[PDB]
Swiss-Prot record, chain A:
GO MF annotation list: calcium channel regulator activity; G protein-coupled receptor activity; glutamate receptor activity; group II metabotropic glutamate receptor activity; scaffold protein binding
Annotated Pfam families: 7tm_3, ANF_receptor, NCD3G
Residue intervals on the Extracellular side: 1-528, 583-593, 643-667, 726-735
Important for interaction with HTR2A, as annotated region: 619-627
Membrane topology: Multi-pass membrane protein
Family that this chain belongs to: Belongs to the G-protein coupled receptor 3 family.
Cytoplasmic topology ranges: 552-561, 690-702
Protein name listed in UniProt: Metabotropic glutamate receptor 2
Binding annotation for L-glutamate: 34, 38, 106, 127, 129, 256, 338
This protein's UniProt keywords: Cell membrane, Cell projection, Disulfide bond, G-protein coupled receptor, Glycoprotein, Membrane, Receptor, Signal, Synapse, Transducer, Transmembrane, Transmembrane helix
From Swiss-Prot, chain B:
Alphabetical list of CDD domains matching this protein: 7tmC_mGluR3, PBP1_mGluR_groupII
Species per Swiss-Prot/TrEMBL record: Homo sapiens
Membrane side Extracellular: residue ranges: 1-527, 579-589, 636-660, 711-720
Location within or outside the cell: Cell membrane
Principal location: membrane
Record: glycosylation sites: 160, 243, 365, 390
Gene transcribed to yield this protein: GRM3
Protein name: Metabotropic glutamate receptor 3
GO MF annotations, alphabetized: calcium channel regulator activity; G protein-coupled receptor activity; glutamate receptor activity; group II metabotropic glutamate receptor activity; scaffold protein binding
Similarity annotation: Belongs to the G-protein coupled receptor 3 family.
Length: 761, 743
């Protein structure tokens, strides 16, 4: 059947008046909510356009509406009449189609657009939301009023980011809706920097056991308490039933498949408490309701399918009466949600035609000779796509602009619904905001978004950390990272790498390189070493006594330079200890190093001269001491030329010290001087094995022997002590200073013990 | 309104460009001689042969439904709309043998994919038809255009032409061809130098500019052409004026047409062109030649063709113009077979055979049109039987095995091309086929004439040699240049040269990072013969002086100890020199220390003069020196490091990797102190001992700095051994001249 009206400007149209044939037939029952209501909406829009002065005033608008029967092949056969009656014939009277407003199902729209692209016939759909009609390579002359299927995916991605949800689950379905939209949702989720679990899909013929298994699979991850539903009505209903059976707590962010529908929450109200759904935004037309209610078959002869619709709706046969006064009122009539889109499409086509007419014929408001061969390409590209007008049957003081983007799609406009309970034993859908270009959620009506008990925390898989580097992301899932704490030995040098530097274990939390604090780790020059330095001061007092010895030298009938040399050596070792303790530096370490060796050599030379003089029985003693001093000077010069500067040393990796040593160390050259002193002491003892007994200056000889024995014992005790303390430079200098001060004090005491008795006697 | 509706059991659609596109006030222009009447006559001849054949559809008779395209896409769509009014008097169409134009084929495929009608093209070579997402019911017996991109790009690989310059005409033919050829070249490691674009609206000024841009690039001597016939002809003519010589590698736009060269045969020579292979059909010539507009009443356009090929008016208005009689006929003098005729027949059979096979699957009980075959499922026929045909060419020449008609996964035909080389022979210019490309190269190099005895066009000068000459890229794209590296570091990688050893000196490219320690191991060379001879002489002298002793004695034991120490000093020279250095590096140092202690004891023996107690005390002092050198050894360790920092010139490695001036300085300082004490004691026989001790002291003082300032590769040990043996020899000379005075 065909539906032809007027003919001045014929408008095409395809509607699913009949449902798809069940028992292998062409067409079956009449689609009341999708084939009759939309058909009457288009007819009402055409009538309003005709009885309208500011749109197509002097030109009348016709119609050539057809039935597609929800079949792509049947739709192709019917749409063949659109091209065969306009331009196919030549270069049932044929009618010239100017535009086609039809196509509810995606496949029907695809086939009709494929047919009409070749013949340059523009088409404007009203219910085709398929995402594969957006590309103009395959569908050049296709436009639509409803938004595509990825706009709701973008809306849910923005919703997930708004609520700070990162690790979420995902449920999809088999077919175009469920697979095409899921890829777009994943793409925007990657663009939204959020995580997708990408769980299993639904084949629309899926058993209850398989649904339960998928529910358990979603329950495997406990941190992702959020699931995204790109499922149809039946799949969503089955999933809710399975969740209710298994008693699983979830919040579901759904799409237009769920919407604000109560048929999917029947018997599963407990499982859905914080369900978030998106419904395509639409408003009811009161004028269309008034037009449709006052419709009866007695005068409605324009619609060939009205009799069948009346027979299916009311039990009337028209052969036997069986019916009377069965007026269609508001009690059993409900306006279909996509009727404003049909009116918008018809009015957009009318406005495009009017604009083209005004541009081509600015003189008269009637068809010109240039309007008979209308060009579909120019009309679509310059006029159909460039439309900006207020939505009819809606006050102009509202952001309702029927416009097409660069791909000819509609303007995104959705409503967000939360399946909540107001407090009683009833459940209902409540709008909590809209999405035109950005979210407009209000945190006042959502039950789980209340400040109490938190806003349903469903954040990322892991948590940020400061002391633990983020370098243990799970292989294959970079969304669940492990806060591995790096060892304190390794500091922070990069963004996520804990690496040691050597000059400190943890300077600060700057996380940019390593900082070496300028300090000394062997800075013992304080009251802690107060005891040793004072002992050195005692040696200085002995030096003062040396001056008294000089006075004693003026009136002593009993050689005299040996005592002066011993006093000078004592002063030298005291000065070396003072230099070591007070301030260690590059120029303050070599001086004491040479001084201690010089003092040791002077003492050894004095002992050797004394024992040689004893065994023999001033020029010879002076020559011997000068030769010993020259040898010591050569030794210290060799030490200096071997390594003069001191650059310090680093500590062991087990700890973090400032400076292990003030100058160069770990050298066995001082062991050579120690061995030379030991050999000198051994030679002195070998000589004194028989030379110790000496009547001439017996007290002096005994004191010299005692001093030599004490020095040998002190050196033999200190050498292992020095070796042990070499591992700890903090106290090694103090131990060496104490040892040398004790040796000097012992030598001075041994020298002065018989002198006092001799003076007193 | 003219159309052919030959009835039959199965009706095959037809679609040919009978009428040229009207550029004036008429939709349809003239009558197309070659791509028009001749191709439809070939299809009719193939249909008649199929009907007369007793092996191909013996019972089913094939009908013909032939329309005209008028060389327009809209007209072709309007005509092909008659092919779909059979399932949605009308005639049921099994398939459509239509095409001859890329736009017409595209539009017809777009219309026919909706109604599931198989379509086979005989001349459409557009690459846009190769995708099944937009044309899932389209097949062709001719290869697509981009196949030629693979036909001659391998030629570039055959003659080692890695640097090419591409020139093409904008539109649809050369556009996709450029991308296909660039992809093939990139897959074959061939880089593109220039990429120009020729236009139909351009003039000689812009052509000369393309040539001028081509000339100012001497490396690229080969130009790959993707252009139409007129563009290539005019470009050759323009290059004639510029006196430009190139090696053109052109596509089917040039082919083997004599119109391309025109009067510019001296600039086109050596050109390589590709032509679609097409054997002539002997039976078609006889069928077409014996045709007159009196019995061929099934061809509505045949009268117009008769009035176009020959000036005739016998059909209508005889007196208006020059009427003709039956004297006008068709023969071989003024008729030539169109190149794409064997494809057209190959298309028709490609349907019939498929249908035949389909029957054998659906109607196997009789040789007739069974009812189950009346449905004529287009999808099943296309995806089950149309794409699975392996029949040979019906009219292939004798001994021609390569004549199987096949369709690949995209429905395209088999790519078979012929390579033509423009040559001069004798004094006549003509084309000559030099090979074929049936998915492989079969060029005949022995019969190819080049521009001037050779075609060198490689941009890269030469491959880089190994041994730090491979280098890397200098900042270009095609190949690279070669620069050397300093030979101390081996080129461990293909771009950089990095050191991997102390001395290294890599040997060849293979195993560059060899061990090659380059140690200072020196055998008994010329500089070593002296020290070993001196050591042997000293050993002989010590043996003589200990043999003369003991027997005649009337220091004693001290003298024997001194002689043993002198012998130890003499053998220390040989101990120091050793090519292999083991982990025991203390042998030389302990030997030197023992020699010094022996000298000190020998001096102290004369210093002292209870004497036996001193002879034991000096041994105890030697023991103290031994424990001191042991403590020294407790702080020094050997190794394999090299003490020379000359890198490439560092061909000597230290025997023991340890700081020489760390504690050896202290040991020598102790020795110097001891010997200075002995010298001071002796300064108070004895004179000779003091003199030789002084000579040794200044000798050591002079030889100490030179071992550190010169830092010889291997002579430091030799000089130390020479100094030691000289000191020992002086001591031995004194201790041997003393008995000379004694005797
Ligand atoms: N706009 C729809 C969307 C439709 C759809 C919507 C929700 C769930 C499943 C589902 O099936 C698919 C599959 C692919 C593309 C679109 C859909 C259309 O049919 O195109 C449909 C409302 C329009 C109407 O028929 O009135
Ligand atoms: N096979 C061709 C190839 C054709 C072509 C061949 C050579 C030079 C220019 C050129 O113009 C284009 C442009 C786009 C696509 C195809 C072509 C076809 O029409 O498809 C053409 C021989 C067939 C015929 O028309 O008889
Ligand atoms: C999401 O986190 C941001 C912090 O960047 C915060 O400002 C915002 O309030 C949070 N939104 C919630 C918790 O809904
Ligand atoms: C091309 O190079 C290969 C080796 O690189 C050589 O074998 C072949 O002969 C060359 N072909 C020529 C020079 O035509």
């Amino acid at each position: 059947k065909v539906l032809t009206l007027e003919g001045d400007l014929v408008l095409g149209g395809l509607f699913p008046v009949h449902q798809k044939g069940g028992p292998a037939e062409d067409c079956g029952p009449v689609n009341e909510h999708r084939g009759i209501q939309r058909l009457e909406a288009m007819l009402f829009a055409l009538d309003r356009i005709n009885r309208d002065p500011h749109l197509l005033p002097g030109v009348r608008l016709g119609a050539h509406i057809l039935d597609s029967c929800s079949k792509d092949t049947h739709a192709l056969e019917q749409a063949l009449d659109f091209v065969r009656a306009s331009l196919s014939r030549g270069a049932d009277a044929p009618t010239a189609i100017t535009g086609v407003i039809g196509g509810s199902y995606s496949d029907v729209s695809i086939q009709v657009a494929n047919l009409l692209r070749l013949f340059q016939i523009p088409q404007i759909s009203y219910a085709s939301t398929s995402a594969k009609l957006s590309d103009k390579s395959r569908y050049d002359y296709f436009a639509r009023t409803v938004p595509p299927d990825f706009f709701q995916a973008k809306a849910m991605a923005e919703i997930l980011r708004f609520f700070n949800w990162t690790y979420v689950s995902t449920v999809a379905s088999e077919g175009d809706y469920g697979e095409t939209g899921i890829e777009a949702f994943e793409l925007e989720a990657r663009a939204r920097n959020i995580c997708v679990a990408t769980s299993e899909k639904v084949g629309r013929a899926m058993s209850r056991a398989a649904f339960e298994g998928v529910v358990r699979a979603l329950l495997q991850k406990p941190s992702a308490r959020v699931a995204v539903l790109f499922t149809r009505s039946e799949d969503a209903r089955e999933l809710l039933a399975a969740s209710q059976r298994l008693n699983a707590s979830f919040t579901w962010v759904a799409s237009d498949g769920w919407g604000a529908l109560e048929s999917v929450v029947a018997g599963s109200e407990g499982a859905a408490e914080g369900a978030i759904t998106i419904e395509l935004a639409s408003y009811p037309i009161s004028d269309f309701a008034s037009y449709f209610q006052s419709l009866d078959p007695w005068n409605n002869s324009r619609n060939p399918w009205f009799r069948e619709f009346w027979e299916q709706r009311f039990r009337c046969s028209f052969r036997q009466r069986d019916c009377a006064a069965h007026s269609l009122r508001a009690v059993p009539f409900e306006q279909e949600s996509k009727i404003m889109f049909v009116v918008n499409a018809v009015y957009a086509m009318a406005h495009a035609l009017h604009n083209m007419h005004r541009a081509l014929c600015p003189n008269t408001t009637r068809l010109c000779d240039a309007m008979r061969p209308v060009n579909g390409r120019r009309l679509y590209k310059d006029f159909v796509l460039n439309v900006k007008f207020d939505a009819p049957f809606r006050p102009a003081d509202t952001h309702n602009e029927v416009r097409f983007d660069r791909f000819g799609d509609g303007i995104g406009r959705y409503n967000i619904f939360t399946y909540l309970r107001a407090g009683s034993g009833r459940y209902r859908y409540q709008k909590v905001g809209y999405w035109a270009e950005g979210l407009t959620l209000d945190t006042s009506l959502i039950p789980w978004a209340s400040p109490s008990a938190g806003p349903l925390p469903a954040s990322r898989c892991s948590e940020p950390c400061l002391q633990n580097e983020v370098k243990s992301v799970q292989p294959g899932e970079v969304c669940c990272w492990l806060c591995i704490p790096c060892q304190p030995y390794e500091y922070r040098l990069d963004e996520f790498t804990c690496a040691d530097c050597g000059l400190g274990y943890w300077p600060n939390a700057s996380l940019t390189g390593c900082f070496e604090l300028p300090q000394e780790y062997i800075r013992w020059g304080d009251a802690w070493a107060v005891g040793p330095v004072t002992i050195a001061c005692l040696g200085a007092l002995a030096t003062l006594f040396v001056l008294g010895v000089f006075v004693r030298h003026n009136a002593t009938p009993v050689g005299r330079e040996l005592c002066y040399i011993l006093l000078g050596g004592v002063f030298l070792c005291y000065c070396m200890t003072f230099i070591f303790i007070a301030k260690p530096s590059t120029a303050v370490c070599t001086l004491r190093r040479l001084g201690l060796g010089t003092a040791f050599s002077v003492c050894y030379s004095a002992l050797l001269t004394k024992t040689n003089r004893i065994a023999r029985i001033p020029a010879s003693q002076v020559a011997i001491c000068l030769a010993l001093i020259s040898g010591q000077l050569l030794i210290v010069v060799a030490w200096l030329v071997v390594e003069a500067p001191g650059t310090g040393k680093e500590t062991a990796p087990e700890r973090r010290e400032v400076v292990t040593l003030r100058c160069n160390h770990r050298d066995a050259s001082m062991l050579g001087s120690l061995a030379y002193n030991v050999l000198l002491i051994a030679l002195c003892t070998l000589y004194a094995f028989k030379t110790r007994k000496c009547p001439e200056n017996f007290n002096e000889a005994k004191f010299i022997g005692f001093t030599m024995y004490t020095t040998c014992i002190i050196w033999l005790a200190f050498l292992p002590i020095f070796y042990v303390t070499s591992s700890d430079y903090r106290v090694q200098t103090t131990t060496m200073c104490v040892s040398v001060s004790l040796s000097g004090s012992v030598v001075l005491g041994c020298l002065f013990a018989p002198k006092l008795h001799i003076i007193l006697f | 309104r003219r159309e052919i509706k030959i009835e039959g059991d199965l009706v095959l659609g037809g679609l040919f460009p009978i009428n040229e596109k009207g550029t004036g006030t008429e939709e349809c222009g003239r009558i197309n001689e070659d791509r028009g009447i001749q191709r439809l006559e070939a299809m009719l001849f193939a249909i008649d042969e199929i009907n007369k054949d007793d092996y191909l559809l013996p019972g089913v008779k094939l009908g013909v439904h032939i329309l005209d395209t008028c060389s327009r896409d809209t007209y072709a769509l309007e005509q092909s709309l008659e092919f779909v009014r059979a399932s949605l008097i009308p005639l049921l169409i099994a398939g459509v043998i239509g095409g001859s134009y890329s736009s017409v084929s595209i539009q017809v495929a777009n219309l026919l994919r909706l109604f599931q009608i198989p379509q086979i093209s005989y001349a459409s070579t557009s690459a846009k038809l190769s995708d099944k997402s937009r044309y899932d019911y389209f097949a062709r017996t001719v290869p697509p255009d981009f196949y030629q991109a693979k036909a001659m790009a391998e030629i570039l690989r055959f003659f080692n032409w890695t640097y090419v310059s591409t020139v093409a005409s904008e539109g649809d033919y050369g556009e996709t061809g450029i991308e296909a050829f660039e992809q093939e070249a990139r897959l074959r490691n061939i880089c593109i130098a220039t990429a120009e674009k020729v236009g139909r609206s351009n003039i000689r000024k812009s052509y000369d500019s393309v040539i001028r841009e081509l000339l100012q690039k001497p490396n690229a001597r080969v130009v790959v052409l993707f252009m139409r016939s007129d563009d290539s002809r005019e470009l050759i003519a323009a290059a004639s004026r510029a006196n430009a010589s190139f090696t053109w590698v052109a596509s089917d736009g040039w082919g083997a047409q004599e119109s391309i060269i025109k009067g510019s045969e001296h600039v086109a020579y050596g050109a390589i062109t590709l032509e679609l292979a097409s054997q002539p059909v002997r039976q078609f010539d006889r069928y077409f030649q014996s045709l007159n507009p009196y019995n061929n009443h099934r061809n509505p356009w045949f009268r117009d063709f008769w009035e176009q090929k020959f000036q005739c008016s016998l059909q209508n208005k005889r007196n208006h113009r020059r009427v003709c009689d039956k004297h006008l006929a068709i023969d071989s003098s003024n008729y030539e077979q169109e190149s794409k005729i064997m494809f057209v027949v190959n298309a028709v059979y490609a349907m019939a055979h498929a249908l035949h096979k389909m029957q054998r699957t659906l109607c196997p009980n009789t040789t007739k049109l069974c009812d189950a075959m009346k449905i004529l499922d287009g999808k099943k026929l296309y995806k089950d039987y149309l794409l699975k045909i392996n029949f040979t060419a019906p009219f292939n020449p004798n001994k021609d095995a390569d004549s199987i008609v096949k369709f690949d996964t995209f429905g395209d035909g088999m790519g078979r091309y012929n390579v033509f080389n423009f040559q001069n022979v004798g004094g006549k210019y003509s084309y000559l086929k030099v090979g074929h490309w049936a998915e492989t190269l079969s060029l005949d190099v022995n019969s190819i004439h080049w521009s001037r005895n050779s075609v060198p066009t490689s941009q890269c000068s030469d491959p880089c040699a190994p041994n730090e000459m491979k280098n890397m890229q200098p900042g270009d794209v095609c190949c690279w240049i070669c620069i050397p590296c300093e030979p101390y570091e081996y080129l461990a990688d293909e771009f950089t040269c990095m050191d991997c050893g102390s001395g290294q000196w890599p040997t060849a490219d293979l195993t560059g990072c060899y061990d090659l320690p380059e140690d200072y191991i020196r055998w008994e060379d010329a500089w070593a013969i002296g020290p070993v001879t001196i050591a042997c002489l000293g050993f002989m002298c010590t043996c003589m002086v200990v043999t003369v002793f003991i027997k005649h004695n009337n220091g004693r034991e001290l003298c024997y100890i001194l002689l043993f120490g002198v012998g130890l000093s003499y053998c220390m020279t040989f101990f120091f020199i050793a090519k292999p250095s083991p982990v025991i590096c203390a042998l030389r140092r302990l030997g030197l220390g023992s020699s010094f202690a022996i000298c000190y004891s020998a001096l102290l023996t004369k210093t002292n003069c209870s004497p036996s107690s001193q002879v034991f005390i000096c041994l105890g002092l030697i023991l103290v020196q031994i424990v001191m050198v042991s403590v020294w050894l407790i702080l020094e360790a050997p190794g394999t490091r090299r003490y020379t920092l000359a890198e490439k010139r560092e061909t000597v490695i230290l025997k023991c990797n340890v700081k020489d001036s760390s504690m050896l300085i202290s040991l020598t300082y102790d020795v110097i102190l001891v010997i200075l004490c002995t010298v001071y004691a002796f300064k108070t026989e004895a004179k000779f001992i003091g003199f030789t001790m002084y000579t040794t002291c200044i000798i050591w003082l002079a030889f100490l700095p030179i071992f550190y300032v010169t830092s010889s590769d291997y002579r430091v040990q030799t000089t130390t051994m020479c100094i030691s043996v000289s000191l020992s020899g002086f001591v031995v000379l004194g201790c041997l001249f003393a008995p000379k005075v004694h005797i």
